[PDB]
Symmetry: D2
Subunit: 109 residues, 4 copies
């Protein structure tokens, strides 16, 4: 999927994808955006831990946590509690949007 | 695709899709959400005109226009000018999120 | 997914999807191909049983089984044992292809 | 997309994709299968030309052509003229299947 909803996480090795774009939460704790085999953007935190996870929070903050639950990296966009989405777009941009402004209200459970 | 970006338009017959979920801008001008063949939600504007288009605007408003550019239906969520997305989620909810809070800034043209 | 591989089955209510096309193994045992809410093709086995499952076999035969395990519909294309695929194509055609003629051999699990 | 239909061509820089898998016809004439940034398989024709194209033929042959239309690589599976598909599978295998054994005959265009 190319969307990471608030309240969800990407475990080590999991990623967002779109066309030839891959945004993966690597094993070495480096969160990289690849265009095929070319690294376009990264948090540059590789080697700072092992088996990190990416968290899209309900406060709007995108945080990379180590297994001890320590913030290795963050987008620093925390604040208003609500519904946010982190999207790996078709234009290669990875953007955080929120909060929800309108909804049909047809969600399931 | 399941995302409609601000500045984009869905022409009559065009839709957003996810699994068995289809959010379509019908030729009768009724914007409907179907679960397989079952209509789950609609604007109930069918028959009000012909060949409408759905537009996700930069003001945050999702508007159904007819060929003459007369608004047939609107989410009425206009406001801050910016970047918004309209998503047909995996939970079957259609939500508008915005504006953008953060971005890797790795887009290409 | 738009592909059903040999050795795989679609349980009741499960489907193959592509754009607005939905190929679903319904609870009433009718196997229908939908284009939005319009029934484009069906096995016409609706009501013959309940809770059927669709099986794409390793002999190339696509069979619909009822809970008692008796076939109620089949493509009748059983033949050479091997690898086959049932695809819901972008042109709206549902085709069975096989067997495999070549492969990179880069498979994993 | 993850499927290349017989009669279709992938120009240089064009690819098949699925998850973190990318099957790309590069500009250097090398046809590589990547798992994220790691090359899992290649035709090894890099540097033999420029701006090559990949063709899934109706005779079942998957061929890499140069700008002058000279074959630079092929699966060597040319045979009976029919309908074939080259699929980048979910198991990470790239396989050619054919010919078509059955169809619903619900295609357009
Ligand atoms: C310096 O290497 C690290 O950073 C690059 C660029 O992000 C990644 O590709 C690689 O896997 C490592 O995590
Ligand atoms: C309290 O600080 C904020 O940012 C850190 C990481 O930067 C998170 O652990 C925390 O949940 C908040 O969102
Ligand atoms: C209450 O949660 C649900 O609805 C909101 C919008 O109202 C979405 O943001 C969220 O993903 C769920 O679908
Ligand atoms: C009354 O019918 C209208 O509305 C239903 C759902 O409300 C749509 O499925 C249909 O195509 C029409 O536009
Ligand atoms: C009242 O103005 C707003 O709503 C109308 C129709 O509802 C849109 O056409 C317009 O662009 C604004 O968003
Ligand atoms: C310049 O616009 C780009 O960046 C913003 C975030 O800054 C995105 O919302 C938008 O869709 C584009 O990718
Ligand atoms: C006659 O009703 C049956 O067949 C139609 C299509 O022919 C399906 O849409 C429906 O679900 C039933 O199974
Ligand atoms: C009769 O042999 C084949 O046909 C029936 C369908 O009628 C299948 O159940 C069986 O497994 C074989 O594929
Ligand atoms: C052995 O199975 C694998 O290889 C064949 C082709 O060799 C494919 O059809 C199948 O899906 C698997 O990837
Ligand atoms: C060895 O270099 C060549 O082959 C590898 C994979 O084998 C490609 O990644 C690369 O772009 C070159 O074409
Ligand atoms: C022997 O010919 C076959 O293979 C070559 C490449 O080797 C293709 O150009 C041709 O169309 C056939 O498929
Ligand atoms: C006329 O061709 C169509 O039908 C065949 C099966 O008959 C498919 O293989 C092909 O892709 C098209 O959908």
């Amino acid at each position: 999927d190319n969307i990471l909803y608030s309240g969800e996480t990407l475990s080590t090795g999991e990623f967002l994808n779109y066309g030839s774009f891959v945004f993966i939460m690597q094993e070495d704790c480096n969160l990289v955006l690849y265009d095929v085999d070319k690294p376009i953007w990264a948090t540059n935190t590789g080697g700072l831990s092992r088996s990190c996870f990416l968290s899209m929070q309900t406060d709007g903050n995108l945080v990379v946590y180590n297994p001890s639950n320590k913030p290795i990296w963050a987008s620093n966009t925390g604040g208003q509690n609500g519904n946010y989405v982190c999207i790996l777009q078709k234009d290669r941009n990875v953007v955080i949007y929120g909060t929800d402004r309108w909804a049909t209200g047809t969600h399931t459970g």
